[PDB]
Enzyme design. Structure first.
Site, PDB file in Angstrom:
ATOM      1  CB  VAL G  93     -80.867-100.171 -68.521  1.00 26.93           C
ATOM      2  CG1 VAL G  93     -82.191 -99.938 -69.241  1.00 26.93           C
ATOM      3  CG2 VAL G  93     -79.782 -99.262 -69.085  1.00 26.93           C
ATOM      4  CE  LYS G  94     -85.582-100.774 -60.540  1.00 28.16           C
ATOM      5  NZ  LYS G  94     -86.393-100.076 -59.538  1.00 28.16           N
ATOM      6  CG  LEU G  95     -85.166-102.845 -69.872  1.00 31.88           C
ATOM      7  CD1 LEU G  95     -84.698-103.908 -70.853  1.00 31.88           C
ATOM      8  CD2 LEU G  95     -85.452-101.537 -70.587  1.00 31.88           C
TER       9      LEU G  95
END
EC number: 2.2.1.2
Lengths: 225, 225, 225, 225, 225, 225, 225, 225, 225
Positions: G93-95
């Site tokens: 997951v990219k934040l």
């Protein structure tokens, strides 16, 4: 050294815009860039329409303009060099740094025509160009990056060599791909950086300038008469 | 310039204080700083009164005084620059380092008006300014620190570039937040540092001075009859 | 900078001794040192006795002698500095590098009186002193060592700064505690080292000199008839 | 500096050999070397003998020749110094770097007699010698090596100090034990290297020279008439 | 590396002296050194006398003793090496670093005899020696100095190479001429320093030791009843 | 790293010679080297004769032997690699560092065949090779020198990259031209140096070795009865 | 560090090509890259179609695949992250590295979801990301170059910080524009370099490879029957 | 090293003071220091009283206490050393680093007595001490400063030598004159710094501590109810 | 050292905000900060109120919280320390680095209470603190900057000393003023940075993050159904 900024484009559109900034010292062309100027604008390559353009570029920028021979061997290079030179006193003749390039460079320079020796990829090539009477040497940074070598290191060796040996030749950083190519050229002590329009435009941009200007102008609005 | 020190203010009280130290070489202003001065006094902020205050600063400091244009585009920047310059020979015109800024810089500088190109956050921007005829470039150290980059590295690159290239442009270290900004600027070889009064007033503070001075006087009085 | 050696004392006997070596360029005093000399001789420190002592030092050294003001406020400092300067042409006026000290430095130097700005513990203090027209700045190496910081680094920063900025002020390495303070100052390119008598006496001493000389003279006695 | 090579010997035979090479600039002696040359040739050491030998050295070399006083105190050093100086215009007077030596240095130099301050083992000693009007200072590399310190570092400090301070004094690398002493002296920028005959003889010798010369000649023979 | 100190001699008297210090780890001999010891005693060098002398050395130093072959061809080197090894378990066989030496080194080492590969003047020689199964390599610092190259740099390259490559071979710093060779070896991380008696005797001789000792005893004696 | 020495040749005679020294760890061949070997001995290059030659090399050296595929697409490279690997367990398969080479490397290495990725001229190529399962990468120093770039720098980047990233791949310094290529490789921490026979034969040849040996033996003889 | 190569694309065709080389370790997408893929396919970007596309990438590459949330507040970021993570175990997951991003990072990471904190332009941003439980941090080199700062210096600070502090987070060099970005990342000890297909395709290209290959095969053919 | 702090004194009063701080690890005495303490107290320096004094120091500091022999010859040193060691288990025997000192060191250390080899002024002296079984070596920084050499450099060489060679001996920085000697020793990686009481008392002093404490307490009392 | 981030405040609201980011490891208070918080709330600084406030902070942050004694002598410092410690297990006792502070540090630390030695402005102070059993040392970067010294250099010396000496004490970078203090601390290898809320809030801010996020979301929206 006072480093000068050049536009590495034949497009006369690109050139007029940067000229207005007051930061444009010269233009370099090469056969490829000459080519796509003429393909894109959609007209055809009269030798008289190629002299019309070059002459218009010279007129626009009011500084040195590089034009490259296409001739193969020294004799034809010299012939073509003299014709290029005659187009305008600003014109500088680009030769390829080959056996034949050297011979032509020697002859052209002895007749007081300024030669830009190009397609340079080693310090040794630049050294030979200098010895044969080049006014400029043009190492290609980006094309060296392209084969996973440090183009900056090419530029460094050439600049350092010219400095140490106190050779009169000027160093043009060519094959510029990004702003940091320009900064490195500047810091090393290159004489000229020549770059595409898109890079030239980038040089000026920074988010903190945008933000700073916006805030400053707001501040003024708050207080002004 | 041999590390000259400027105040960033429009307070004549502040200017006169530091001037008396003998260490004040110049002043940099902006509309907000001038607004602050006028609110303190209660004077209405008309164009002519603004000019008169700038003139007053010039006559007090007896060195360069920077004034910032609020005009949006080049033509109006040049118009405003000419007006500002006409206030007093000492006035230096501050422009933002944008396309429009560069245009105005070229034109103002060509008329012998000294230009200080501001909101500079890269060596490339400083370079463009230099090419466009800037007399001063003003990198902002503190604002760079603010975004977790080393403001000092910006200053270093600009100073080194100008040194190596022997460009006549002078470097003002601006956005000075703390005493060590001043020292770093001095050591790197910046030409000028401009700073708030609060920072100027901090520069002299070292506990060992007062401790030494106290002991001197104590020892002195001990031997007096 | 052709570094010169000074004594940091008010003891006439000490100054006489080193003067006779032919290597003594100058003397720095301070209120503590002067009080020490008066206490040692059991003499009350009067205006007349102080003046006589300064003249005696001046005549003994035949070079610059620093005498420090005791006044704390600029106007009084200037009056006192004028008095000090008038005692003997060799007198250099020491001021503390404080706000008031800068103000007095400006005025005295503006008059052509040579000022030694003292109690300096930061490069910034030295910078401001220089800007205000100091002839000399006197960083205190030893007192910085005393608080577990590197006194040599204070000196390095000040010399480097003055070199990079090409400030005309001269740097005195003061608060010298050991021979290596002197060597460090000399290598850095400080202008003057001023040191206690005991340190001055040490400089000359190296066991290998004593040993070499003895052997030379032995070998001579052997073969001379 | 244009570094010069000296012979550190009293041996007359040693000196005429190297002189013939065309590379011998000067000679240094000391009480030990002189004594060892007189006990060698069996000859008794009078004032007249000593003077004749010194005069013979001067004639052979055709450049500066150092002769060292044996007098203990400055008065006698000055007297002896004048006598030595009178033997030949080439004669440089060696004094030991002591308290008495400084005094005699000051006086002799004032009278236009060139002084070589010797038995130097620290930069500070060399500094004192410089202040006293020395024409040369002679650090002893070898005797420092002997006590397990780096003689090279002594030389480096003295050379750097004198470069940085731009003192007119010339640095003689003395107590030279091996060829690399000479190379280091040269690279550092010492003015003179003075060495025993055996080391001087070594300098020329590299096996590749002999091997290369043999091969050249053998190849030449091979194709001769 | 826990660096060990060896004597480079065949003098039993020299070896005895240093052995009693408690700091002697081993001995290296070579044909020249052995010749010298026999010539000094006026004794003929026979196989039996040589063996007897080696036994005497081994029993004195009680650590490794290097004895060198004189044969030039590998087969003879191996036979000679075996004879040497059998004299005393502490005998290490010295071979010259030649083609034949490598061959003999491989065979002797394979048999469990410890080989010291000597007459090494390049890192490449040391590397080949290591690959051939050398227990020790012996670069000659002094002989490199003799031809105006830096012996220390030879040692540095060899030590660095062996550290980087984690080769099990031990580095003996040989051809030692002065105390600083020993220090250089120690700092670099050589395994062994083998040195002449004269150098070994120098190592302790710093003047400040005896000066300090004298003062200690003087102060002690003042206060004793 | 324990650097090993390889021969870069297909000459059985060369290999036999160096193998006898006890220092030969392996061999690299390439299509050119094999062609040259077959031309020189007058044999036609068939599949069977190639296999027999490779067997001979494997048996002579008793270590890894690199043999290069000539197919240009991956499937054929794999088939050819398997054939080569089957000749002798010590065969390492050389592939060119190309798109197809990576593909073949991945498959061969997954099968447990050791792959030497060759014709490498950038660190990026070596990195890709490593990711694809290479056991060895072979940068070409000499061919880089040939185009006036520093071959040593290629080796440095690759070695440093592999050290920093702790990649298991081993680095072969190839295209070796002179002894100093070998030393540089050793000092950098390359795993293997593979060199022409002519270079291998140079490694031992330092003049001081034979000069020293000759003197040793002379001294030895003088004392024999 | 064992640096891995990733593709920075959402193009399945690009990913398939490089996967086949055996050198592809993972894929990073961002909202722009995905949009561009969906535009050029002509397909509708729904939740179902996004998921199926991401799943396809995961299956192709067989390693980590980064997918970025578009929610702007932490609660929604976490909900979105869970949905993404549920697509396939390989999903990272990219934040964005913002206040809300940190909050979401903390929660997602605590739940055992791998978080890639992106849009990082300072070391301080990377540090906060690490503290919040990031598995990866993704500095953007090229976008920093774009504003005339050294993107490489950003990477260096982050890598050096994570090395010095022994933080378990992995560093992805992102916003890669040219081959030398990749080399720089590798040399510095970055863990991953993620790059456009165009740059990936460049990495192998060095002219000496194809020149060498061509000659190899020419020489090979000549000796075949 | 976990550097420990020692007192270099025989004053019980001084030792009691610093012991109470909780930072005192040990004491070094020497003959001068012991004499001084005995003279101050008007006490006769007998064997019994010396022993009682040393025992008292041991009990106060509860760590190692160095006591120096006065004997100059090894046989007497060993007898004296045994007597010292028997006073209290914490006694470390100091020997001078001379030829005889080495012999005594070897024997005493062999018997399990801890030996501190003192009066060390070169790395070579420290090296020999280590070889002879020393537990500690004590270089004298201040006395090296005294002769215009860098005592810090002596310490550096010794520490680096012991680090590189991984010798078990501990380095005591002795002859400490100022706080920066202590910092230098700490940064270099010395094992122990032993210093006079006066220096120990300086370590804690910094003006900013005093200033900060006073402000804290003022701010505190302002808001107390 | 896995550097942790702390808040240097007594404000519960500030602490709450950052805690929620998931990046807050602890809090430091000092008498000023606690004073300020209490005067802001208009609350009476009683003993029960101080304890309640501290306990609240402990519960909010869920890591170490520093609370400073105000007593001036050791016995009372220890009494106060125990009272603080008993508030909550997470409480760390701050003592001033003075003679009395060392004494209290020794006792408290011996009892198993964690002590943070503060008002540190030299490496020597930190060293003493370490020897006295400190768990943390807190150098003040900003207050050093304030007196025109380099606060970073203080931190460097302390970190380097702790590293070289492998002391178990943890280093807190305190008196932090700007983001680059945090970065410097991180790069050096400080264990903790404790900073004001305002600085903490700055850390995340970089303009390119928000610019990139905005573009991402635009591009995304274009394509969504």
């Amino acid at each position: 050294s006072h480093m000068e900024l050049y536009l590495d484009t034949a497009s006369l559109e690109e050139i007029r815009e940067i000229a207005a900034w007051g930061v444009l010292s010269g233009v370099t062309t090469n056969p490829t860039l000459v080519a796509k100027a003429f393909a894109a604008k959609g007209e055809a390559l009269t030798e008289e329409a190629f002299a019309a353009h070059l002459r218009a570029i010279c007129e626009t920028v009011g500084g040195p303009v590089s034009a490259e021979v296409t001739a193969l061997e020294a004799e034809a290079m010299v012939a073509e060099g003299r014709r290029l030179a005659a187009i305008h006193p600003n014109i500088v003749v680009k030769l390829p740094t080959t056996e034949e390039g050297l011979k032509a460079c020697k002859r052209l320079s002895a007749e007081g025509i300024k030669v830009n020796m190009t397609l340079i990829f080693s310090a040794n090539q630049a050294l030979l160009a200098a010895r044969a009477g080049a006014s400029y040497v043009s190492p290609f940074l980006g094309r060296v990056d392209d084969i996973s070598w440090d183009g900056g290191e090419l530029l460094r060796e050439i600049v350092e060599m010219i400095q140490v040996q106190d050779l009169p030749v000027k160093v043009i950083a060519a094959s510029i791909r990004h702003p940091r190519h320009v900064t490195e050229a500047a810091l090393l002590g290159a004489d000229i950086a020549t770059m595409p329009h898109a890079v030239f435009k980038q040089l000026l941009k920074h988010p903190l300038t945008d933000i700073g200007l916006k805030r400053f102008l707001e501040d003024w609005e708050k207080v002004k008469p």
